[PDB]
């Protein structure tokens, strides 16, 4: 029959080759994902149509900050074929309440906290 | 009360001014149209 899929823990154990291809650190990892749905929930089972509603990814190509914790990551492991996961990197820090209204999330995955529309 | 003071500026209550309490009269559901009748319920 067609059931849900238990993906083994070996698949989510990154190799030291993988830390060189994608620019991640094993020690001190990132805190917040940027989840973006890139596939439809149609022609997918109902246990994936509801997980996508649980993460807020009902719209395609709309990013969403989620924590990098093993309970949010258990939901992202169900629908990893539907989404695209990238780390939210913060070149400057998290925005204060003065820099809250001048932020922008870039396509590199970084959240700049001062966003003028002037060239360098 | 004060509502009898509001009636002085308002025009006179006649038989062309009356209206039931909103909630009393429900609309009739008669089977004409696209929704309310094709096989009519």
């Amino acid at each position: 029959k067609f059931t849900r899929s238990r993906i083994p823990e070996k698949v989510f154990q990154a190799s030291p080759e993988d830390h060189e291809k994608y620019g991640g650190d094993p020690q001190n990892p990132h805190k917040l994902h940027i989840v973006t749905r890139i596939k439809s929930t149609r022609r997918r089972p109902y246990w994936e149509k509801d997980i996508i509603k649980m993460l807020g990814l009902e719209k395609a190509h709309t990013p969403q900050v989620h924590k990098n914790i093993p309970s949010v990551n258990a939901k992202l492991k169900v629908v990893k074929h539907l989404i695209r996961i990238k780390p939210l990197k913060l070149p400057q820090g998290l925005p204060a309440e003065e820099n809250m209204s001048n932020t922008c999330l870039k396509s590199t995955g970084e959240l700049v906290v001062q966003w003028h529309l002037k060239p360098v | 009360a004060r509502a009898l003071d509001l009636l002085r500026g308002l025009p006179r209550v006649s038989l062309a001014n009356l209206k039931p309490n909103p909630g009393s009269k429900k609309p009739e559901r008669r089977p004409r149209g696209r929704r309310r009748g094709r096989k009519c319920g």
Binding site: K31, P63, V65, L94, M100, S101, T103, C104, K106 | -
Partner: protein, 85 residues
Amino acid sequence: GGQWRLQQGLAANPSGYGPLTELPDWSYADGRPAPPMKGQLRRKAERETFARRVVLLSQEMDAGLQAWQLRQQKLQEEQRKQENA
């Protein structure tokens, strides 16, 4: 051509962020600025509740790490305050 724009750090759509769709489309001829676009007020409000979510979710982790860093010390002096008498 949007796989080149993703390498420069721009949005893959040119209608995303950037100077084309965030600057004001017009201004008064004397020089007074225009009232802001309804799509710019809606985008800046949607970018704020995203940045509020970065501030909220990051602090819930850091306060959640310190609580475990205290509960693993309160577990520890419970081990040493029974080793007497």
